[PDB]
């Protein structure tokens, strides 16, 4: 009949601008999954029952009654459709590690934005296992294990949700936590790239464009070293060649952030470290330090300590249970023999209760000797400083406050070959200084870490840097010029891709921001834009401007969008960063991109880590539930859309018969062709055409969150024929795709079936979203897909 | 704000609207019974992987009461999730019977499929299984009823010819569902009260055509009461001689359900095959049927399907034999009788009618038989005089055929002359009307089963059953008079089922901006639909009436129900509430099996809010302890007399004896006891903002459950799967009166917390005052 208002499926009454807002809102909950591995199936079943009956959590048990790749396929195909349902989902995995390994299950979990718990080692009465199981029921529908990462150090404290003393509330800073998660994942991705490209460990250095403090920690957590690139040097305003002897004067609650601050910076300066007063050095256990050599001096050191430290960090650890001999000015003393003709830095955390000032006289005289050696490239020495008397020092680059010592009096000195050749430190300056430092707030003390970070900063124009050697760079806002910036950034990226460099690029997505503004989600108050020029502002009222970019602009410059989900899942085997709890609308406005050469080299075979599985079904299923679209009816609508499209190209209806089912979109009756800038699309008599359904649903999802569509399109281009699985990868990572008897990934679609889907994409979006879609989002996707399939 | 749980940023009037919208989807469940577990596993995998449907299989690896408890406690939390749920039941009928599984399905607003008799390669079984995958998230079996006759046609969703679309009139279909359920509830009432079959008659207040069909589907006879009788404008003593102008066999159903309303004994002339009768429940009726094509098998199949006593005669009826001893009419001596004459002939039809007319003019006047009504087809080209003609009517489903229906009756015109020209011109006009206007002429037939009278004045002796529909909420009835009428019905132990707009639910829907004044406006309790009086739960409980939801009525009535189901829930229908008399609630409903329970409402709104607002499971109970702390402070209870625990098992512990003043108390708390407040009361207060509420029926049951209570011996114990049972096999006690009234006392602050102060104080107020009456001292 006439009005669609009294017909189903119904888009006209169910999808208005407020439905679109609601889909945006629901996307903040799009990470419901917990993957929990344990070796006791009766225990799994008990907690599965407890959490589903008490909170409605959906529960699955992969117990080995079914072959593992089939059980994964069944379980995660179901889950993929449900990720926007706003209900928790838990998969218990109780098969052996030899059936599905820790690393494979963690990859799958993170590919579905889930938290991951591995406890299969544990006995049935293990207090930790029972604790984590009971936590499922206490916290559901939330969980206190982070998603997509083992650790979290933000303000959220799940135990506060259970305390009457806090009114059973805790902090929740989604954007800040997600931004930190993102910095972590980008670092992890570069770590994975180094590993995949077999870069020598001493060349695992990444350039961060723009000073970004968290990267020091994230890089050392991943065993790579950071260096910042700044266009200009703000004046430290102190004495010494560099102004770091007394210069003028995100959330991360790490337990011993004090010792982490110095040590992660010092581990940047050199792969070889002399550490005096090392015991216990428990904060080092969290880092990845393959390729580092740590010579540790302390009377408390045991054989047990050394072995634990090398096991946990991977560094070469020579632990000697002695006091250091600061009286012997010989390179042959203190075992410094191994550091001959090598770069070395020294972390001195020794101190004495009585005669401290004169203890500092013996060490400083040792460090002044050691700092100008010639058989050892001595790079930097860190020493505690508390001088009540006046003393002159040689080769002193930086006399610095402690950013995490919180109103204490002790200071830190840094010896360097190019520090001041002579300088007398008086005690009234330092007392009046540390008085100023004691006065400043907690936040202000921490931020003096900038002064330590100057020493691992480079001035220069990032757009002019040398990109040879597969150089790794992380770049977003600061990657820009003062002049002609957008054009210069895209040329730089295009050049970087041509050079086979690894410049990782992020930017606000123009058409997603414009869409979120148009439907009324983002206000002019918070973010404005004219064309691709965007003005941001926080409640503080500080404004900054930056350019939005689109997928087709980047592809034209040789760059392919990848999601944060894909980066962390791809990097799962080396990842040692933080996870997250909530998704953030603000973060979802940004897209991240990697150069085309690396996608072609390493990502054309779509295992689950590089797949769109966690986006390709959940928006479609949400809309079908809201709009009353039966499963088979959905495929009928696809057929009707293709019928209308072919008629608009004056294809005569006798050359094809519409089927509109899940297996056949239409059947070709007689030979015809459709003009297309990537074609013509050719259709042969007596064949079935089945268009690419993933293209259609990814085009919807690209309205709301960062899109895997370009990476998918390159994979789809590769999958015109069967492709043998890579021998170096666990076959289980391909569970979600069809595999032939020969062990090959089975072909997906012809180029016709893909480009036909691209051609009807706009009308599909208009149908599913009741003409409240974005033609611009569709158009940039369509243009990029046509470049992928360029003729 | 940057804290969780978070109601301040998550719940605004727009969230409230979205909750109303999600309530249209609150019937996601399918219960599918079959005998083949590998088939069940295959389609479970197919529908969950393709559409995300949540699937459960009850296969007997776990004892049945525990499996049901586990499965449906889980499902109760998910009913507002806007995702399909399928429970496959593969245990034998001996483990859980068809009627029990159907009662459970419908108590959870589900569709129900019973196919456990089928073999693994049954084409019907596979067909219904594949339908799950094709239609998901929808399904083409109706919820809460076997049949459906509305305009929604699921096959059309699959056809390119229709553009893969079909009709969807949620409000009209749910109103028709409602009529059907109200009828089946009265049929359940008649059965529980063992009313004799001859007395199973219900009065419908206000003319409402569909009730004739729903009543005969349940073996009940309808009677309409209307305050004023508009004369139809035609000839004869009642104006029914030429008055001024879905189901595959609605033609035959329309006349026959009406004719079956007039007498328990029927002479059916020309009855074969009468397939449409097989769908009615006709226990208590006797049908004498004449047709040559009648066989013994047709007779047996007819009595088996309907429960009627069928005498099938394989002859032509003899219109030439003018004695009560002929045509076997002897079985009807000293009883009522009506006659349905479906015969016709294509040669000499006029003379055949002439002879039949002579026969019926004699028959209507018999004295050894009380002949109530005779119907005959009428197509005459000659002028002809007629005696005892009560009505001469078009066939409302006659499309454009030229045949009429004559109705003989002892109170018809003693003699009248029917002019063929007049009837011809009447048929000219009728066949040229639109189909809708044609159908609406069935009101002339229903005139003959309508009584004029003020319903508020009617006699209510003998447990009389009345369906007031919405009619008594019309503003021409002062609230004062209706409530005294209802109060008198309850005291007289009558069964008047009463419906009315719920004043406070409607005001809330308007306040939040769901309903516009362009559609509905209200001043206090006077409501104008674009007019009725709204009623509230506290007004009606004072008049002896208890709210019951439509879900509970159909689940309670499930073993006699033979009505229609529905597919969509409807915002408009949910604005209304239904009420039954307290005396029946106390007699038959205080033991809460699953049919009379709030299980399908008490979890799904709370879980939905907790998901939106980031409320952990344990944190929810901490909030409840915090609310109780504040309440006790506000009553100047010294905080050293209690310690807040705020957990699922203890709300607080009592340290020293203390008391709280209360109009139903005082509430007494003994030292060294744990107090656990009634969580169901709090959840139902939320649900009552959005849909009709089981709160008052629940409260009566809760009052009964201060102590353990033995299970009713003549009910399948599996209907009690969802409540705790004691070692000795009793229903375990629920809560003390202190624990219930404490909940009522904090109810307002709980709704303000859960809905970010966008709740309705009036809805909470009417519930709290009714609960206090339930617990009155
Ligand atoms: N991973 C992946 N596999 C595909 C893709 N397209 C086709 N295939 C293979 O072909 C099958 C289905 O193709 P499609 O017609 O796009 O169907 P779909 O993946 O179920 O998506 P819908 O068509 O919307 O139902 C899958 O089982 C794949 O193994 C694709 O885009 N990505
Ligand atoms: N079968 C049944 N049992 C009830 C009902 N109301 C209360 N109970 C019983 O009383 C016990 C405590 O009830 P409540 O505290 O009111 O509610 P609850 O089911 O525990 O749910 P929450 O307290 O909200 O978490 C329950 O575990 C039930 O066994 C009811 O309506 N039906
Ligand atoms: N492990 C665990 N299970 C629970 C907890 N609370 C409830 N459950 C499970 O959830 C089921 C449902 O109980 P529920 O409906 O919440 O009743 P209630 O416990 O009295 O509030 C129970 O049978 C328990 O198995 C809990 O705190 N821990
Ligand atoms: N029985 C049945 N199963 C289906 C149908 N469509 C999909 N499925 C099942 O659902 C599973 C998931 O299907 P889908 O998500 O479309 O992926 P794909 O069919 O493998 O490309 C498949 O293993 C199918 O067997 C259908 O029309 N009937």
β-strand pairing of A58-62 with A89-93: parallel
> Residue A22 is nearest to which of B18, B83, B137, comparing CB atoms?
B18
Please give the Cα distance from A519 to B346 (Å, whole number).
69
Burial class of residue A543 (count of CB atoms within 10 Å of its CB; 0-12, 13-18, 19+): exposed
In angstroms and rounded to an integer, the radius of gyration of the C-alpha atoms of chain A is 29
Return the residue whose CA atom lies nearest to atom 7 of ligand 2.
B734
Give the ligand with the smallest distance to the CA of A749: 1
Give the ligand with the smallest distance to the CA of A55: 3
Neighbours of B6 (CB within 10 A): 17
Peptide bond into B137 cis (omega under 30): yes
Structure tokens at B299: 């007779």
Q: Say if CB B545 and CB B582 are below 8 A apart.
A: yes
Please tell me what DSSP assigns to residue A164: G
**Geometric angle at alpha carbon B209, from B576 and B564, rounded to 5°:** 65
CB spacing of A87 vs B81 below 8 angstroms: yes
Q: What is the largest CA-CA distance in chain A?
A: 101
Please give the Cα distance from B129 to B36 (Å, whole number).
12
Residue of B nearest to A634 (CA): B164
Residue A591: which H helix or E strand, with range?
strand A590-595
Q: How far is the CA of A434 from the centre of ligand 3 (A)?
A: 56
Give the ligand with the smallest distance to the CA of B701: 2
Helix (H, G, I), strand (E, B), or coil: what is residue A706?
A: coil
- For chain A, the residues before each gap (C–N > 2.5 Å) are 249
β-strand pairing of B384-386 with B416-418: antiparallel
Structure tokens at B308: 């009627």
Atom of ligand 2 nearest to the CA of B594: 1
Residue A749 in contact with ligand 1 by CB distance below 6 A: yes
Structure tokens at B72: 């449906």
Q: Which residue matches tokens 């106390």?
A: B586
Residue A601: which H helix or E strand, with range?
helix A596-602
Q: How many helices (H) and strands (E) does chain A have?
A: 26, 33
Handedness of CA A548, A551, A555, A558 (dihedral sign): positive
Residue A77 in contact with ligand 4 by CB distance below 6 A: yes
> Residue B167 is nearest to which of A6, A156, A637, comparing CB atoms?
A6
Q: Say if CB A737 and CB A712 are below 8 A apart.
A: no
In angstroms and rounded to an integer, the radius of gyration of the C-alpha atoms of chain B is 29
Handedness of CA A450, A453, A455, A457 (dihedral sign): negative
Peptide bond into A680 cis (omega under 30): yes
Please give the Cα distance from B402 to B349 (Å, whole number).
13
Peptide bond into A9 cis (omega under 30): yes
Neighbours of A148 (CB within 10 A): 29
Atom of ligand 4 nearest to the CA of A81: 15
Region of B388 (left: φ > 0; alpha: ψ -120 to 50; beta: rest) is left
Task: State phi, psi for A580 to the nearest 5 degrees.
Answer: -150, 165
Neighbours of B281 (CB within 10 A): 18
Q: Say if CB A706 and CB A43 are below 8 A apart.
A: no
Task: Establish, for the pair of chains A and B, how many residue pairs have beta carbons separated by less than 8 Å.
Answer: 163
CB spacing of B164 vs A640 below 8 angstroms: yes
Residue of B nearest to A27 (CA): B612
Q: Say if CB A86 and CB A29 are below 8 A apart.
A: yes
CB spacing of A632 vs B45 below 8 angstroms: no
Please give the Cα distance from A431 to A433 (Å, whole number).
5
Neighbours of A468 (CB within 10 A): 9
Angle between helices A631-648 and B123-135 (to 10 degrees): 60
Residue of A nearest to B644 (CA): A164
Please give the Cα distance from B255 to B338 (Å, whole number).
12
Please give the Cα distance from B358 to B345 (Å, whole number).
17
**Geometric angle at alpha carbon A580, from A576 and A585, rounded to 5°:** 135
Helix (H, G, I), strand (E, B), or coil: what is residue A560?
A: strand
Please give the Cα distance from B444 to B433 (Å, whole number).
16
Residue of B nearest to A89 (CA): B54
CB spacing of B52 vs A78 below 8 angstroms: yes
Residue A587 in contact with ligand 1 by CB distance below 6 A: no
Determine the residue of A43, A49, A50, A134 to mutate for testing ligand 3's pocket, defined as the one with the most ligand atoms within 8 A of the Cβ atom. A50
Q: Which residue matches tokens 């096991």?
A: A311
Q: Say if CB B341 and CB B269 are below 8 A apart.
A: yes
Neighbours of B380 (CB within 10 A): 19
CB spacing of B2 vs A628 below 8 angstroms: no
Which has the closest alpha carbon to B541: B748, B771, B765, B777?
A: B771
Please give the Cα distance from A310 to A292 (Å, whole number).
10
Bridge partners for A683 per DSSP? A672
Q: Say if CB A659 and CB A639 are below 8 A apart.
A: yes
Please give the Cα distance from A76 to B45 (Å, whole number).
11
Structure tokens at A42: 């009766």
Structure tokens at A56: 């409605």
How far CA A170 is from CA of A32, B5, B68, B616, B644, in Å, comes to 19, 8, 37, 11, 20
Q: Say if CB A785 and CB A713 are below 8 A apart.
A: yes
Please tell me what DSSP assigns to residue A100: S
Task: State phi, psi for B224 to the nearest 5 degrees.
Answer: -95, 140
> Residue B4 is nearest to which of A53, A78, A169, comparing CB atoms?
A169
The string of DSSP letters for A503-569 reads EEEEEEBHHHHHHHHHTTSS-TTTEEEETTEEEEE-TT--EEEEE-B-HHHHHHTTEEEE-HHHHHH
Neighbours of A159 (CB within 10 A): 9
Half-sphere exposure of A61 (CA within 13 A, CB side): 17
> Residue B611 is nearest to which of A4, A87, A617, comparing CB atoms?
A87
Residue of B nearest to A168 (CA): B619
Structure tokens at B400: 């454009």
Strand spans (E) along A509-567: 527-530, 533-537, 543-547, 559-562
Q: Given in angstroms, what resolution was this structure solved at?
A: 2.1
Peptide bond into B5 cis (omega under 30): yes
How far CA A217 is from CA of A292, A314, A325, B226, B655, in Å, comes to 16, 17, 31, 83, 52
Q: Say if CB B404 and CB B438 are below 8 A apart.
A: no
How far CA A669 is from CA of A168, A279, A662, in Å, comes to 67, 80, 19
- State how far residue A158 is from chain B, nearest Cα, in angstroms: 10
Please give the Cα distance from A751 to A774 (Å, whole number).
25
How far CA A348 is from CA of A259, A274, A279, in Å, comes to 12, 8, 12
Q: How far is the CA of B583 from the centre of ligand 2 (A)?
A: 25
Angle between helices B695-704 and B737-754 (to 10 degrees): 150
Neighbours of B652 (CB within 10 A): 24
CB spacing of A6 vs B625 below 8 angstroms: no
Q: Which residues are CB-contacts of A436 (< 8 A; sequence separation ≥ 6)?
A: A249
Please tell me what DSSP assigns to residue B712: P
Please give the Cα distance from B42 to B61 (Å, whole number).
18
Atom of ligand 1 nearest to the CA of A747: 9
| Chain centre to alpha carbon of residue B110 | 14
Please give the Cα distance from B593 to B595 (Å, whole number).
6
Residue B497: which H helix or E strand, with range?
strand B495-501
Q: Which residues are CB-contacts of A636 (< 8 A; sequence separation ≥ 6)?
A: A660, A661, B157, B158, B159, B160, B164
Peptide bond into B273 cis (omega under 30): yes
Region of A291 (left: φ > 0; alpha: ψ -120 to 50; beta: rest) is left
Structure tokens at A230: 């700044």
Residue of B nearest to A6 (CA): B168
Which has the closest alpha carbon to B746: B696, B679, B700, B692?
A: B679
Half-sphere exposure of A529 (CA within 13 A, CB side): 22
Q: Which residues line ligand 3 (CB under 6 A)?
A: A 50, 53-54, 134, 137; B 73, 648
Q: Say if CB A190 and CB A472 are below 8 A apart.
A: yes
Q: Which residues are CB-contacts of A23 (< 8 A; sequence separation ≥ 6)?
A: A84, A619, A622, A704
Residue B505: which H helix or E strand, with range?
helix B503-511
Burial class of residue A706 (count of CB atoms within 10 Å of its CB; 0-12, 13-18, 19+): buried
Residue A665 in contact with ligand 1 by CB distance below 6 A: no
Please give the Cα distance from B88 to B112 (Å, whole number).
10
Handedness of CA B115, B121, B124, B128 (dihedral sign): positive
b/e per residue A647-682 (b: at least 16 CB within 10 A) = eeeebeeeebebbbebebbbebbeebebebebbebe
CB spacing of B137 vs A1 below 8 angstroms: no
Residue A453 in contact with ligand 1 by CB distance below 6 A: no
Atom of ligand 1 nearest to the CA of A697: 24
Which has the closest alpha carbon to A410: A442, A391, A388?
A: A388
Neighbours of B226 (CB within 10 A): 19
Length of chain B, in residues: 777
Please give the Cα distance from A328 to B736 (Å, whole number).
83
Give the ligand with the smallest distance to the CA of B591: 2
Mapping DSSP onto H, E and C, the string for B79-103 reads: CCCCCCEEEEECCCCCCCCHHHHHH
b/e per residue A210-232 (b: at least 16 CB within 10 A) = bebbbbbbbbbbbbbbbebbbee
β-strand pairing of B673-675 with B652-654: antiparallel
Q: Which residues are CB-contacts of B465 (< 8 A; sequence separation ≥ 6)?
A: B186, B189, B190, B201, B202, B203, B494, B495, B496, B497
Please give the Cα distance from B266 to B310 (Å, whole number).
10
Neighbours of A781 (CB within 10 A): 27
Structure tokens at A251: 């959330």
Please tell me what DSSP assigns to residue B720: G
Please give the Cα distance from A487 to A485 (Å, whole number).
6
- State how far residue B607 is from chain A, nearest Cα, in angstroms: 7
- State how far residue A169 is from chain B, nearest Cα, in angstroms: 6
């Amino acid at each position: 009949m006439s009005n669609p208002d009294y017909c189903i499926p119904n888009f006209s009454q169910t999808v208005n601008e407020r439905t679109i807002i609601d889909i945006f809102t629901i996307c903040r909950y799009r990470s419901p999954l917990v993957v929990f591995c344990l070796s006791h199936n009766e225990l799994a079943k008990k907690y599965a029952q407890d959490v589903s009956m008490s909170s409605g959590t959906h529960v699955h048990i992969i117990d080995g009654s079914v072959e593992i790749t089939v059980s994964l396929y069944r379980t995660f195909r179901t889950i993929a459709t449900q990720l926007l349902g706003r209900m928790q989902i838990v998969v218990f995995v109780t098969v052996d590690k030899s059936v599905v390994s820790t690393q494979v299950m963690k990859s799958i979990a993170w590919a579905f934005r889930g938290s991951f718990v591995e406890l299969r080692n544990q006995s049935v009465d293990s207090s930790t296992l029972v604790s984590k199981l009971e936590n499922l029921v206490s916290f559901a529908p939330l969980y206190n294990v982070p998603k997509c990462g083992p650790d979290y150090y933000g303000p959220t404290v799940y135990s506060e949700l259970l305390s009457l003393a806090t009114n059973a509330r805790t902090h929740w800073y989604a954007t800040i936590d997600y931004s930190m998660f993102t910095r972590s994942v980008l670092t992890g991705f570069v770590a994975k790239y180094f590993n995949e490209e077999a870069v020598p460990i001493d060349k695992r250095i990444v350039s961060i464009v723009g000073y970004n403090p968290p990267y020091v920690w994230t890089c050392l957590r991943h065993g790579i070293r950071p260096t910042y690139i700044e266009k200009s040097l703000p004046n430290p305003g102190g004495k010494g060649p560099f102004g770091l002897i007394l210069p003028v004067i995100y959330v991360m609650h790490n337990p011993q952030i004090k010792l982490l601050c110095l040590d992660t910076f010092m581990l940047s300066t050199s792969m070889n470290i002399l550490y005096i007063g090392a015991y216990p050095a428990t904060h080092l256990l969290s880092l990845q330090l393959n390729g580092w050599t740590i010579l540790a001096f302390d009377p408390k050191i045991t054989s047990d300590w050394t072995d634990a430290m090398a096991k946990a960090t991977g560094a070469k650890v020579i632990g000697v249970s002695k006091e250091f001999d600061f009286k012997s000015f010989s390179v042959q003393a203190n075992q410094l023999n191994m550091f001959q003709n090598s770069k070395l830095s020294v972390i001195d955390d020794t101190w004495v209760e009585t005669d401290y000032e004169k203890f500092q006289s013996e060490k400083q005289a040792y460090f002044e000797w050691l700092i100008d050696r010639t058989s050892i490239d001595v790079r930097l020495i860190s020493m505690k400083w508390n001088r009540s008397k006046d003393t002159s020092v040689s080769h002193l680059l930086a006399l610095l406050p402690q950013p995490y010592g919180a109103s204490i009096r002790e200071m830190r000195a840094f010896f360097h070959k190019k520090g001041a050749s002579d300088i007398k430190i008086l005690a009234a300056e330092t007392e009046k200084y540390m008085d100023d430092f004691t006065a400043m707030s907690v936040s202000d003390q921490i931020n003096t870490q900038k002064f330590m970070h100057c020493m691992i900063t480079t001035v220069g124009d990032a757009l002019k840097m040398d990109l040879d050697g597969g150089r790794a760079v992380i770049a977003s806002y600061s990657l820009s010029n003062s002049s002609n910036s957008k054009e210069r950034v895209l040329k730089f990226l295009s050049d970087a891709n041509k050079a086979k460099a690894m410049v990782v690029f992020g930017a606000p997505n123009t058409h997603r921001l414009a869409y979120a503004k148009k439907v009324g989600l983002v206000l002019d108050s918070a973010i404005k834009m004219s064309k691709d020029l965007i003005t941001f502002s926080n409640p503080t009222g500080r404004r900054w401007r930056d350019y939005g970019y689109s997928q087709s602009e980047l592809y034209d410059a040789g760059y392919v969008e990848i999601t944060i989900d894909q980066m962390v899942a791809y990097s799962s085997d080396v990842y040692n960063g933080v996870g997250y709890f909530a998704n953030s609308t603000y973060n979802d406005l940004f897209s991240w991109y990697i150069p085309k050469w690396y996608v072609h080299k390493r990502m054309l075979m779509q295992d689950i880590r590089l797949s769109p599985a966690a986006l390709v079904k959940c928006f479609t299923t949400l809309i079908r539930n809201i709009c009353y679209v039966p499963h088979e009816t959905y495929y009928r609508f696809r057929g009707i859309l293709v019928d209308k499209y072919l008629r608009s190209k004056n294809v005569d209806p006798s050359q094809y018969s519409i089927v509109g089912s899940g297996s056949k979109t239409f059947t070709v009756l007689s030979h015809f062709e459709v003009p297309h800038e990537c074609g013509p699309l050719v259709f042969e008599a007596s064949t079935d055409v089945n268009i690419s359904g993933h293209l259609l649903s990814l085009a919807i999802a690209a309205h709301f969150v960062a899109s895997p569509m370009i990476l998918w399109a390159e994979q789809m281009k590769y999958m015109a024929v069967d492709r043998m699985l890579p021998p170096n990868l666990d076959k289980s990572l391909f569970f979600d795709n069809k595999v032939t008897p020969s062990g090959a990934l089975q072909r997906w679609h012809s180029r016709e079936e893909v480009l036909l889907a691209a051609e009807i994409c706009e009308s599909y979006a208009a149908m599913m979203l009741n003409n409240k879609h974005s033609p611009d989002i569709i158009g940039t996707l369509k243009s990029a897909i046509n470049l992928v399939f360029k003729i």
